[PDB]
Amino acid sequence: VYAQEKQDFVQHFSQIVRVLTEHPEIGDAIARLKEVLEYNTIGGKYNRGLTVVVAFRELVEPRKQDADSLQRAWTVGWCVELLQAFFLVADDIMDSSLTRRGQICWYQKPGVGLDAINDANLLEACIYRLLKLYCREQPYYLNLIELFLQSSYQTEIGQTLDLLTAPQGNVDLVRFTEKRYKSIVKYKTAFYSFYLPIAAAMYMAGIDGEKEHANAKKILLEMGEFAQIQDDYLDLFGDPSVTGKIGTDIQDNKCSWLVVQCLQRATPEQYQILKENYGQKEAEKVARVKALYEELDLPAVFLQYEEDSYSHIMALIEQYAAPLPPAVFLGLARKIYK
Amino acid sequence: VYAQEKQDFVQHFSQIVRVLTEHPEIGDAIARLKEVLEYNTIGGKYNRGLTVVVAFRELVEPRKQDADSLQRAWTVGWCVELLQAFFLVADDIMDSSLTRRGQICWYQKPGVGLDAINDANLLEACIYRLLKLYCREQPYYLNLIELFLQSSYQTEIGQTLDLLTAPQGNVDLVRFTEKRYKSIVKYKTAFYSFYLPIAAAMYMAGIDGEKEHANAKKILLEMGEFAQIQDDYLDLFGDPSVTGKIGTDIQDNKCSWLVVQCLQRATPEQYQILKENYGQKEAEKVARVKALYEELDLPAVFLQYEEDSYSHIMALIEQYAAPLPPAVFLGLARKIYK
Ligand SMILES: O=P(O)(O)C(O)(Cc1cccnc1)P(=O)(O)O
Ligand SMILES: O=P(O)(O)C(O)(Cc1cccnc1)P(=O)(O)O
Ligand SMILES: C=C(C)CCOP(=O)(O)OP(=O)(O)O
Ligand SMILES: C=C(C)CCOP(=O)(O)OP(=O)(O)O
Ligand SMILES: [Mg+2]
Ligand SMILES: [Mg+2]
Ligand SMILES: [Mg+2]
Ligand SMILES: [Mg+2]
Ligand SMILES: [Mg+2]
Ligand SMILES: [Mg+2]
């Protein structure tokens, strides 16, 4: 059922590429756009895009789910996937990453390099091309434009906080606090990965009320915090065959949930070990940090946190889901918790 | 009068920064946004922003130029300056440039580096923040949003053509044609630098007709082609004390107007000299190309072209300006021709 939902969503990508790549003077640039789309918008789990499609189906009366409305829903889900693609192509450059979704990062491909900066911006531009082509006559068109623009700004402010807290070649242990961590992840991840897909489906379903969006946001931003904590845990302890990418948080001096938890539990001797080995390229220094995390039983702390987080998000669904179907939030929680 | 217009426009920047930098959790990111704005949106000529302000004043009845409408006009002119800033910060990374507006490029500043990618995207995001804060209740709000989004897409397609025609470490003389050149510059420069500022003032003045915008575009895209040809000429023959930047077109293997003109005039012996020396970092190779350009009297070809271009644009103003005041176009031509 879930594998079928994913296959159904991916089968719409060929039409998305077709409409985006249809004077002959820009032909060569349009061929490059097609290559950028095929490399960077495919290969992920499609959690955000599928959330738009399933939430729309659960929020709109089936008699109103005609062929054109369903096409608009699939198209807006692909818009969120294009936003994800834009963020990841640029993030991989700024984080000096090597692989993404089981292949070399686009910018690391021979012949691409920093031209990937413009390619990332083309992916973002395609969102607004698709919204104009399919949604311009709809009453929610401006709501969707402003929602995507706001989500991009919030993510970029979060990325600024992430990069400021992680200066290259400078110790920043003093700034690795739970308060700083929560702000980084709320802005860099929670808004675009959890609030945006549900909010887009809500606007398409005619649910535009400030209070209903605020209540959904209460659940979704908390889900988003867990998703980034899980991402931080997997950066170091995930299987690369499963995650599809190589971790860089320790080398990049990141304010990861792991280092925040390490600092809260470390003895003065362990603090000194972290200070001397964190945020540096040397593989033996990275191994020393991982050994410290294992000595402090951080994988067990993460598993206990996942349990407590799940119970907290479920309690927030009980408080704030109404009048929306709880299934809207439960289905998204299922995608991130196991 | 013109120096006074520039000073009046720059005096509004402090309020632009104030409104964009006003929870305390993102405080550190907002301080970085202020630094990005002060470094990258100031120091230029403000030709695009001033065009919005002067064209609005010339297109709107003075009785309708109340304090709030004039504020909206200044704000939209600063939005075009933020779009310029976004494009330049990223272009300087992709072109491996050293200086911009008389100072080191933002990405070359110690401590910035490739974090400049996210900084560039923050500048673009501020456009939509300003349009929502000052223009959301106006009838032209959606027209302006779509105009800025379209101008960004066109510029990015042009940047793709520019970078595809200029592969690093590969000879691309065969693709340096007048037809390829005209397409690159129409998309990368002409739309955002000439059509966007006038079109924004037209929409704010209530001039939204397809035919009127098409007629203005006929003049403006041709002006834009000359502006990029002049930029290409100055890359090599301009005084850096005046241009504020160091040229990189020869080292970067760019489809510059100069190399297009060189190829049209070169003997087979000169073609071989260009083939062996173009698109390479070696200063002696760059000097060989410049000497070839001087041997082919390319500065004289440029001066004759500037004369013929000016007469052509003036003939297009005579054909297509009506019903707009010709002063709208003449004032912009004055900014680029001497
Ligand atoms: O996929 P990644 O690189 O682990 C990541 O989650 C990517 C990302 C990019 C933009 C916003 N949020 C997450 P990061 O935050 O760099 O750890
Ligand atoms: O200022 P520059 O770098 O000479 C330039 O004009 C900058 C630019 C950036 C984006 C679009 N158009 C021009 P380029 O095209 O790279 O020669
Ligand atoms: C915000 C985060 C954690 C970045 C990765 O998101 P995903 O794990 O959803 O990545 P893909 O499925 O799109 O590859
Ligand atoms: C599109 C071009 C030619 C890039 C530079 O524009 P300007 O010459 O207007 O640059 P600033 O005044 O903003 O520095
Ligand atoms: Mg990353
Ligand atoms: Mg990152
Ligand atoms: Mg990560
Ligand atoms: Mg450049
Ligand atoms: Mg360039
Ligand atoms: Mg140039």
Report the 3 state secondary structure along B184-225: HHHHHHHHHHHHHHHHHHHHHCCCCCHHHHHHHHHHHHHHHH
Question: Using DSSP, how many helices (H) and how many strands (E) does chain B show?
Answer: 16, 2
Cβ of residue A187 closer than 8 Å to a chain B Cβ = yes
HSE-CB at B202 with a 13 A cutoff on CA atoms is: 25
CB A77 within 8 A of CB A53: yes
Q: Are A72 and A138 in contact (CB under 8 A)?
A: yes
Please report residues of A whose CB lies closer than 8 A to that of B183: 25-26
Q: Determination method here? A: X-ray
The DSSP output letter for B43 is S
φ, ψ for residue B56, nearest 5 deg: -60, -45
Residue A113 Rama label (left phi>0; alpha psi -120 to 50; beta): left
Task: Report the C-alpha gap between A117 and A91 in whole angstroms.
Answer: 10
Residue B149 pairs in a beta bridge with none
C-alpha of A11 from chain center: 22
- Measured CA to CA, the distance from residue A227 to residue A194 in angstroms comes to 9
d(CA B327, CA B39): 33
Cα–Cα distances in angstroms (integers) from residue A263 to residues A186, A254, A257, A278, in the given order: 21, 13, 10, 12
Q: Tell whether B171 lies on the interface with A, counting CB pairs under 8 A.
A: no
Torsion sign (Cα): A11, A13, A14, A19: positive
* Spatial contact of B331 and B54, defined as CB atoms under 8 Å apart: yes
**Phi and psi (nearest 5°) for B298?**
-65, -35
Q: Is B26 on the interface with A (CB under 8 A)?
A: yes
Which pair of structure tokens corresponds to residue B300? 């004289």
Contacts of A198 (CB under 8 A, 6+ apart): A51, A55, A216, A220, A328, A329, A332
| Chain B interface mutation, best of A94, A144, A156, highest count of B Cβ atoms under 10 Å | A156
Q: Is B100 helix (H, G, I), strand (E, B) or coil?
A: strand
Q: What is the dihedral of CA A36, A38, A43, A48, to 10 degrees?
A: 80
Task: Give how far the C-alpha of residue B326 lies from the chain's centroid of Cα atoms, to the nearest Å.
Answer: 22
Please give, rounded to a whole number of angstroms, the shortest distance from the CA of A160 to a CA of chain B: 6
Contacts of B68 (CB under 8 A, 6+ apart): none
Judged by a CB distance cut-off of 8 A, whether residue A161 touches chain B is yes
Q: Do A156 and B118 touch (CB under 8 A)?
A: yes
> CA triplet A218, A223, A224: central angle to 5 degrees?
100
**Which among B280, B264, B18, B277 is positioned nearest to B130, based on CA atoms?**
B18
Question: Which residues precede gaps in chain A, with C-N > 2.5 A?
Answer: 22
Q: How many residues does chain B have?
A: 338
Q: Identify the three-state secondary structure at position A99.
A: strand
Annotated resolution, angstroms: 1.5
Q: Which of B48, B12, B6, B52 is nearest to B200 (CA)?
A: B52
CA of B118 to the centre of ligand 10 (A): 23
- Could you tell me whether strands A99-100 and B99-100 are parallel, antiparallel, or unpaired per DSSP bridges? unpaired
CA distance A96 to A114: 12
Please provide residue A250's backbone torsions phi and psi, each rounded to the nearest 5 degrees: -65, -50
Is B99 known as a binding-site position?
Answer: no
Instruction: Decide: helix, strand or coil at residue B104.
Output: strand
Amino acid letter, residue A251: Q
* A302 CB burial (10 A radius; 0-12, 13-18, 19+): buried
Q: Which two tokens stand for residue B88?
A: 């330049």
Torsion of the alpha carbons at A250, A256, A258 and A259, rounded to the nearest 10: 70
Breaks (C–N over 2.5 Å) after residues, chain B: 22
* Bridge-based pairing state of the strands B103-104 and B99-100: antiparallel
Sole residue written with tokens 């005209």 = B182
Query: How far apart, in whole angstroms, are the C-alpha atoms of residue A318 and residue A308?
Result: 15
How many A from CA of B98 to the centre of ligand 4?
A: 16
CA dist B42 and B10 (Å) reads: 8
Distance separating alpha carbons of residues A37 and A120, to the nearest angstrom: 10
Report residue B30 as tokens. 């907002």
**Chain B residues close to A113, C-beta within 8 Å:** 168
Do strands B103-104 and A99-100 pair parallel, antiparallel, or not at all (unpaired)? unpaired
- For residue A151, give the nearest of A294, A52, A10, A283 by alpha carbon: A52
SS3 A48: helix
- Is A244 strand, coil or helix? coil
Interface-testing mutation among A25, A88, A133, A186, with chain B (most B C-beta atoms within 10 A): A25
Q: Which CATH superfamily is domain A1-338 in?
A: Farnesyl Diphosphate Synthase (1.10.600.10)
Could you tell me the two tokens for B3?
A: 């120096």
**Calpha distance B20→B22 (Å, rounded):** 6
**Euclidean distance between CA atoms B127 and A122, whole angstroms:** 18
B14-23: long-range contacts, CB 8 A cutoff, minimum separation 24: B16/B75, B16/B78, B16/B130, B19/B130, B19/B133, B20/B126, B20/B129, B20/B130
Residue given tokens 């920093």 in the structure block: A114
| β-bridge partners, A100 | A103
For B174-203, b/e burial (b = at least 16 CB within 10 A) is eebeeebbbbbbbbbbbbbbbbbbbbbbbb
User: Residue A218 belongs to what H/E stretch?
Assistant: helix A210-237
Nearest to B91 by CA among A288, A103, A118: A118
Contact B167 A111 (CB under 8 A): yes
Query: What is the C-alpha to C-alpha distance for residues B314 and B330, in angstroms, rounded to an integer?
Result: 8
Atom of ligand 3 nearest to the CA of A227: 3
How do strand A99-100 and strand A103-104 relate by DSSP bridges? Answer: antiparallel
Residue A227's identity, in one-letter code, is A
All residues at 6 or more sequence positions from A230 whose CB lies less than 8 Å from its CB, including other chains:
A306, A336
- Separation between Cα atoms, residue A131 and residue A139, nearest integer Å: 12
Catalogue the long-range contacts made by B267-273 (C-beta closer than 8 Å, 24 or more residues apart): B270/B295, B270/B296, B271/B173
Helix, strand, or coil (residue A170)? coil
Q: Give the amino acid at B93.
A: I
User: In this structure, what DSSP letter does residue A206 have?
Assistant: T
**Token output for A301:** 């702390």
Mark the residues whose beta carbon lies below 5 A from ion ligand 5.
A 91, 95
Phi/psi at A287 (5° precision):
-65, -35
Is B29–A161 a contact, with Cβ atoms under 8 angstroms apart?
yes
Query: Collapsing DSSP states into helix, strand and coil, what is residue B46?
Result: coil
Exposed, middle or buried, A69 (CB in 10 Å: 0-12/13-18/19+)?
middle
| CB distance A49 to A197 below 8 Å | yes
For residues A149 and A83, give the distance between their C-alpha atoms in angstroms, rounded to a whole number: 10
Q: What distance in angstroms lies between residue B246's CA and the mean position of ligand 10's atoms?
A: 9
Q: Cis ω on the peptide bond leading into residue A323 (within 30° of 0)?
A: yes
Of A189, A237, A258, which is best to mutate to test ligand 1, by the most ligand atoms within 8 angstroms of its C-beta?
Answer: A189
Overall residue count recorded for chain A in this entry: 338
Residue A10: Cβ within 10 Å count: 14
